[PDB]
Structure formats: structure tokens, C-alpha cells
Amino acid sequence: HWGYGKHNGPEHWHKDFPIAKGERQSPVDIDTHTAKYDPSLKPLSVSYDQATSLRILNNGHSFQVTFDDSQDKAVLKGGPLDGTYRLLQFHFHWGSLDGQGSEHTVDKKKYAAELHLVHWNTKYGDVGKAVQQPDGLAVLGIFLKVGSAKPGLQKVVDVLDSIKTEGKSADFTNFDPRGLLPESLDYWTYPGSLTTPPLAECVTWIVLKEPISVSSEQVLKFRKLNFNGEGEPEELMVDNWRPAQPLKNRQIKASFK
Template sequence: MHSPLSSFTIPLILLVQSYGVSAASWGYGYNDGPQTWKGDCQTGLRQTPIDIRTMDTDYALMDRVNFIGYDQVDEVTMQNNGHTVATAGFTEWKNPPYVSGGALQGKYFLQQFHLHWGKKDHEGSEHKIGGLSYPAELHLVHLKEGLTITEAMNKSDGLAVVGVFLNIAESGEPLAAMADKLDDVIYAGNETDIDRFRPRSLLPSVTDAFYRYEGSLTTPGCSEAVQWIVLAEPITITRKQLDQLRKIRNMEGEEHEKNFRPTFPLNGRRIRFRPAQYDRLRFCSSSYSLSFFITVLSTLLAKIIF
């Protein structure tokens, strides 16, 4: 297959090396954790993750997100980079997967995906919903068509990241292909190939409902170059698969206590929400139009009154 260098050039830049930040210079511990990260990580005003709360959210008329080429099956490479487990190789497929729609301007090609988790079930996801966390969160990282990674880092819409929450359940189908290989990447620097991988398996059955906001990477240097799409519907992970994730080792050879960043204030940003039931044809119907008009009017009145 492809060489590890070509597969992971972009993922490594995105995850462990932004503008001179080396893999070994940061982590999630007391001495090297998020509280010590420099630059935009400390001073940026559009940082990620955030706590998605009703009071900060507006209903928005956005198209669905189109996941093009996500049903393909091909080979990818999974690597433990010392901070997470990242899977890449999609850019070398004959028809690389990409996303469009969802208020994105253009096509964004899938570069890699990775996971965040914690040691306890009540924490692990980077984003929160009303102050509550899921036990893990998956990020699908996309690069805007026509841009280099350096160019993308300097644009507010250079990257599009799709966040997917993971909830503990009996079904482990979404992560099955990946879970079968997790034991091969326990230690930092380990990597392995997955012969047959279908990106669509990482998405919930319903992707119509999602949250949209402008934010940043959640790792150094926290570049504010990301259009975030956080899917409202989670996928499932089994207790066994979650235990496998929790055995992954960091740069020091220790199991991660956590590898998620704390949430940040919105600083004036608003979160847009597309409900699953929104449909242009239904919106044209009188009953749906009236219902939606009442919802919008109520939101506006609440803002004026309070």
C-alpha cells in the first residue's frame, strides 16, 4: 500500500505538529496539558471545544451534509501518534471521500479521523451538550478543495471537522473494523493497515440533525481554521471497545487518563442547529411554515425581552 510518510503527513501536521509544535512538547497531563499550550490555544477567541447549550443555539435553514464517497471500501492505515489513534489514507483512494452542503462553501476532502476519550464514562467527549459529556467523541477531519494545509490553517474555513459522539451500547458495529486492530497500536509509533474500511460506518443512521459553528483545532497550535459540524445523533461503542481504547498508551508509555480538551466560551459566537425534520418540501407546506414561524418569532421575542 502507500508509505506511512505519505499517509500521515497531513494527519501529523493536524494532530501533533502545527507551526513548529512537536509531538513530544505537549500532552494531556499536569505538566504538558491544555493549560500549558501556547499561542492561539490560550489567546484565541474562537476556540474548540464548546458546551452546546439551548440558550446559545438558533434554528437555521441549512441543507443536509452530503457525505460523498463514504460508502466506498478501501485500505487505510491506523497509527498511535502518542496523543490518539488516527486513521488515514483516504486521499489516496481512487475517489477520495468528501463532504459538502451543511452551509459549507465548497468540497472538503477527508484526510483522517481520530478519537478522544476518558477513563470514566461520564467524560471523554470534547464537546458537551448542556453541560453533559459522552464517553468518547470521533472527529472526521476534512481539507477544503484547492488548499494546501498551510493555506487552510490561515483561513477561517480552511478545514471542516465532523464531530460524532459515541454512546455505550450492545452494538459495536460502527467501530468494528477499527476495534479489531486496536491491539496492534497500543504504543506510540505503532501502526497497522485495515484492509477493508468503509467511512460510512462511522456515521449514525440519521445525519440530518447537526450543530454548526466556527472554531478551532483542539490540539496545538489550536488554529482557528475549522468549520465545525457536530452531529446530534451518536453512534455506539461497546464496553469492550471502550476498554480497548483506554489501554492505548501515550508518549510516556502510560495509558491516557484522558485525551480531551476542556470547553471554551463562545465569545459572542452563535451555534446554528439544523433539526432532522427540516425539509424544503415540508417547509413549503402551510402547517410547517406556521410552526417554524412561531418558533423563530418566539426566539426573537425572548432575545428582546431578556
């Protein structure tokens, strides 16, 4: 199946998912000097006060924290978005070393990791329907650099030993994703895609300019996860990022001057 290795990695995905070579693929390099400030972008609204986390899961490509999306509890609105988008899950992409791991890049700079908070447009009723629409999903992307620890990440890090291998999950209730956000909500936005198969062109990307800092100990715990299932040859879950794709006929807009 698809993965991040030499024989099943991003350069192979187009064979099973031809949209991999499409017109609005993600991630992209964000050229900060070419992105244009758009004074018409309304303010971004992150309303996570009523979030209900459910489970944490190793899916063989990342780990994810899942939320109750059966009501408007944790929602993203405003910015470039029309309507209301419910938080379904968050997950990360990271590297084998601190100089790579992010999917988006900024003036070709790679960060150590990237957090994706995945939301779907309630006008389509369920996420499966939303993935079939050009404005079905909104992903809030946040860069991670290594320095000081992020206290709001520690509860995640401390349960990873319980989901080491593909297929494992654990209860992960009462987690507050507000603890993963930087101070500023300044952002870049563009129309793109899922960065893992099926690579559907259904995402409004909102990438925050301000990274969060995490400690070396925190990212080291990400790197102890396994791509493999229990009993199979151990292959560390590292470098689970897709590289930047061609921008093609798109403009990246900035919310800030």
C-alpha cells in the same frame, strides 16, 4: 512536549500556542436552548462510497485512520459549507471512565468519547495550506455513549493491540467509515479551531446531535492504548480531551427544529 497531563495539559498549551486564548477556540459547550434553528442551512452531504483507508497510527495523543486524499474520493459538502472538503483522517478522544471523554458537551453533558472525521477544503490544494485559512477544514464530530456495540467500529478495535505505543502504525485498508455514522445527520454548527496544537482557527465544526452507541468492551480497548513510546514508563492513553472553551462572539446554529 504538549499532552494531557498535569504539567503539559490543556492549561499549559497557550505558552507555546498563544491562539489557545483566541476568539474562536474549540471545543465548546452546546447550549441546546440557545442554539438557533437556521432554515437556510442546506442539506449535509456525506459521500464516503469511494473512501480509501490507508493506515492506522498511534501518534502519542490519539489513534488515527488515514485516507487517500489525493482525489475527491470521500468528501463532505453542503450544510454550512461552500465547496468540497476531502476526508483526510479520523480519530477519537475518550475518557478514563464513561462519564467523560468528549470534547464538545451538550448542556454541559460529557459523553464517553468523541469521533472526529477531519476534512480539508480542496480550493486550498493541500491540508497544510488549508490550516492557514478560516474556512480551511471541516470536522464532523460524533458523540459516543456506552451501551450496545457498534459493529462498524469492531475492525478498528481489533487492531489496536498492534499500535499500543506512540510511533506504531499498521495497514488498515478497505475500512468503510460509513459504519461509524448515526442514523440522523441533524447537526449543530459553529466556527472554531483545531482542538490540539497548533489550535489553528481554521475549522467549520459540524457536530451531530445523535450519538452512536459503542460497547463497554470496545471503549475498554481504547483505554489500553499508551501515550508513551515502547520502553518508557507506561501511561495509559485516557482523558485525551480538551475541555470546553469560551464561546465569545459566536452563535451555534441548528440544522433542525
